[PDB]
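Job type: complex structure
Entries:
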Amino acid sequence: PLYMQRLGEINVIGEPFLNVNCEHIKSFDKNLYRQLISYPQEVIPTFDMAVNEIFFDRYPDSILEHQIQVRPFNALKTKNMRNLNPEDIDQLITISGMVIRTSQLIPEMQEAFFQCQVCAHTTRVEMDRGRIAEPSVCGRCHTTHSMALIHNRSLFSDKQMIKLQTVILFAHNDLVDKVQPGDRVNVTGIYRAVTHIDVIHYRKKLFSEKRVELLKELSRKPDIYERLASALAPSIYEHEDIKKGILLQLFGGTRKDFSHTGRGKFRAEINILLCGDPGTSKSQLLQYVYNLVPRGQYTSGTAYVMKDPETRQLVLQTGALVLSDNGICCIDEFDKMNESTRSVLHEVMEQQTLSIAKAGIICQLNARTSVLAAANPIESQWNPKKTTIENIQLPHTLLSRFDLIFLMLDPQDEAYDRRLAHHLVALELLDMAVLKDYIAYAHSTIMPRLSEEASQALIEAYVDMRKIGAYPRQLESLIRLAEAHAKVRLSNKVEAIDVEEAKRLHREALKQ
Amino acid sequence: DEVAEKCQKLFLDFLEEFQGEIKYLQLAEELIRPERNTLVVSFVDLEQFNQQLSTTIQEEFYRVYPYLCRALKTFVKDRFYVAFQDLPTRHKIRELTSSRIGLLTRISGQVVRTHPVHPELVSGTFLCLDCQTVIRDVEQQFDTNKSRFVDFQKVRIQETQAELPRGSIPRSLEVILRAEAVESAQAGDKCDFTGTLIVVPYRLVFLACCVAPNQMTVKEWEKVFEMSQDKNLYHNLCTSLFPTIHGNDEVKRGVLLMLFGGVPKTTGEGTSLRGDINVCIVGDPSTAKSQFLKHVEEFSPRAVYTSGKASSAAGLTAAVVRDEESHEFVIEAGALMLADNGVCCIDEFDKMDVRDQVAIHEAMEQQTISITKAGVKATLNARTSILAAANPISGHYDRSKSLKQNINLSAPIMSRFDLFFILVDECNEVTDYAIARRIVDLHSRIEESIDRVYSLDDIRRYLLFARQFKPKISKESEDFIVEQYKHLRQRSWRITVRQLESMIRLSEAMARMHCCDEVQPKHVKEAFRLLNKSIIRVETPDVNLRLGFSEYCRISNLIVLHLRKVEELKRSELVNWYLKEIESEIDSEEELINKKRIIEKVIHRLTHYDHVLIELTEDPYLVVNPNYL
Amino acid sequence: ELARVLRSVFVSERKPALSMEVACARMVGSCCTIMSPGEMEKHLLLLSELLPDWLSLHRIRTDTYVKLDKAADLAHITARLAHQTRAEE
Ligand SMILES: Nc1ncnc2c1ncn2[C@@H]1O[C@H](COP(=O)(O)OP(=O)(O)OP(O)(O)=S)[C@@H](O)[C@H]1O
Ligand SMILES: [Mg+2]
Ligand SMILES: [Zn+2]
């Protein structure tokens, strides 16, 4: 029995709260589980009484702030928010969702303090069923209608109203302020209609051993990198380097905290720019990335302030860029966008943060996103020129901020047209479904670190690269790419292969 | 409440027995004065006198406060309000919960809005209109002649920037001040308020009683003293403040100087002279500029960061907004006035519109901001130092065009910056190697690649101690400054009296750095170079064992000055003089032999390559080429 | 002085035990000298090792919690600390 150890831990800590898994109740007693589902409001007091009696029998000298309360969680009823029916009123329900807004601290009376107006006789009245049992006679002088209520002396309970993505959630006392907007929570509570949900518990590994073994077996294949490149976007032909770059961006770099150095948190997420004629694989690839990647965002060429109709207070709304934090945001027609927005992009591209100073509102926001942008040359045709600006007309700052820039040119080769037409007229499954979980596992588990041989290789690479013209930011991007390629092999150390591959890809992109 | 009577008796005990002189007797006697009606009591004295009473007052302050006032009145009448101070625990606004109602806690915040003084009736004498019965001493649950009134003030406060979590709106709290606490707080100030959180019909309101704005430990004081005697303190501070940035030490010296700052002076004509320094940085994208901003932001707690284009004119200085409840017009603070007596950092200053820079103009020089919009007339203090970062018109500094053509800044804006550095990126192999090795070492060896001579907290303590001194300018420094400015002004960025004031401020900052009560000409000589340099490279190339160009020029200047002075010598004699002069730096025999090697090589090189020194016939006579100035 | 501050914090919090993070954050936010959290942690460890009877530490799960006896006389503790400092000299 784990519950006796839980009671002992509670005795050690003194926190009167019990977390009970509903599956244990179902396995132990199906009838009791059904009773809990049907009438939680009546069985929870019985559970509290039982656990309190057991704890006091075991340790009667407990100086507890409050009686031990049972908080069940993870019920079988994981119904969707849109599947609610009038039948399950006053029944336990579990819903996963996103938190949008949380209200301020709302005090609610639970004990009413009444004092006699003559002899100052004091009494306490329990608040029950939304009605106040105000005493009408005194306990000392028996004077009728001599009771006065003191708000300060009364007992208040904190309650909070939360909007979940919609349903209204009511957190009470301890549960108040435990959830921050922008997080995904599994809320367990009783369904009640006036509709609203009263919160009882908040919930904020996923792979079996066979899945890990299969991942290791695939990784031991030296061809896994190219095989996954072939697996990405099967409908897209002869863009293997682009798929390689997309996969490296999906892996990304590793996060490092430089708090001890006094330096700001350096960007560790990869951004790629694409330029070419419209009607090419831009839109299809962007849609594929947006659909495949969870929390992805698709936009076409920011935060804003909203009035609260209740308190007349100016609240803030989060744009798609903020909503896609720790995700991937893709943009089409980068050239055709206003200069005002592209000026704002410099801050999010560089510092991963965003600062606003307007109408007295000063705030800073975290914007950990990867930008995959598609752009159209100003000539709508690859005019024979030298610099990419001569064809696309983009400032040096934005181009320098991009880690990888790729150009889509339709070659004037007959065989290429034959292959394109055959691919269209003729227009794997084992890979992408496994790959989503594989990428999640790689992100959660491993992180690479740099080595001395890679140090020397990168130093020589930089000193050779500047001879071609080169900025240190491309060196940072090369470090990030080496980390990504190390993540590809599931190797905890960055070796010569990663640096050589990153340098090869960068030089190939520059040559193209 | 029996415990309230016990608390009253114990408060009488504390008032009558605390000592070898009772501290509160004179204050109680002064309470007889009509203008004095609140008593200030230290919390540490209460807790040391007894613990049960201290805990009870800390836990039931609202319950026993009127009994405390009754005890105070009884004690005074034997020969009124009670105020408490020096509570050792500081709390955050986000920590305020319903569980803390009735607790004596003190809260720290910044005042944003104020309201006028209102009379509050406490006890009212009521006359019945039916039987003409006078009902006296009627308390109010939130005849004017015989009733009691107490002054009131309403204060709206806002969360501090440091305590503000990222992505969160700073919540506002209402503060009630009564009796002597009225008018003790001013808008725009940061204060700590001691009191309780009361429940208003519900609504959350904090009741406050008091406001807040040699004794240092022996070891900290001695560490500050010992480090103040370091001869290489300037270079050590320069290295320690930017351990992870390679080269460009001139910007480091400039930012350190503006951190020190000068002294402001107000003339008898009422005109105030700015004692601060404004710095502008323009450079090619390669050179690190935002890193300096981040470092100065994380180091200085009084630093504010903002972007260029995203900031409007109203958001920088202030804006006029109509208040919903009052149906009137108020002023909401801008970034500049929140950075009062601090430093404000602006990134991408070029992207800002001219309509914003013209608003900045007034705060730049006059150090104040004035608003005359929509019937609201006011002036506000903007005592700030501005650090601006920008890039040239084109991403690349084009040498085919003149210096003036390359910078798109207005002439007064160019003039009102004291130090103006321009960075140009060059392709040098040794600089590339150094930058690459530093970056990779930082990336691989995050913590072990940092060697700080002094702790950041130690630097902060020294800076706090040093800033309060106000050095005096000597007559020698006076005429040296006169002649230096004579020479300087005789040569786009025109040099006007503003640059002379900046030079005086720089001399004062150098004087404050060295903890010297008087200003010496050495500070003037040091600042003259930094004012002159303007365009500055990343790193000077080595000179053939290698030696720096600046050190080479320093040695040449010293030797030429000594020879020219002696004109109104011998090789060995001059070397002996140099070794005598440099004795304060050499600490080992190896350094002596290295210095001998260096001086022999430099003398030979000047004799046979630069021709500045002429040999006249083992110890040849050396003379200066008569065309070196 | 840090001991006095810790005593006052435990008086204010109305709690028998507190975590390292919250206690260190409050002490730093209330101390007269700016210090790093690591220095505060080492100071707390030194206090625990020198004076175990007053101050006790309990390792629970993945955290260590701080419990103190509030009834001890502060003057006697200050005298004991002064004696310990003199002995260490
Ligand atoms: N001397 C240096 N020491 C160490 N790193 C450097 C140095 N110079 C440049 N870097 C690197 O180059 C990066 C560029 O820094 P930034 O200050 O952002 O450049 P910038 O000149 O401000 O360009 P903008 O204005 O942001 S487009 C830094 O983050 C460092 O990684
Ligand atoms: Mg920058
Ligand atoms: Zn009665």
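Summary: The radius of gyration of chain B is 33 Å. The interface with chain C takes residues 47-48, 55, 58, 88-90, 92, 103, 105, 217, 220, 457, 460 of chain B (CB under 8 Å).
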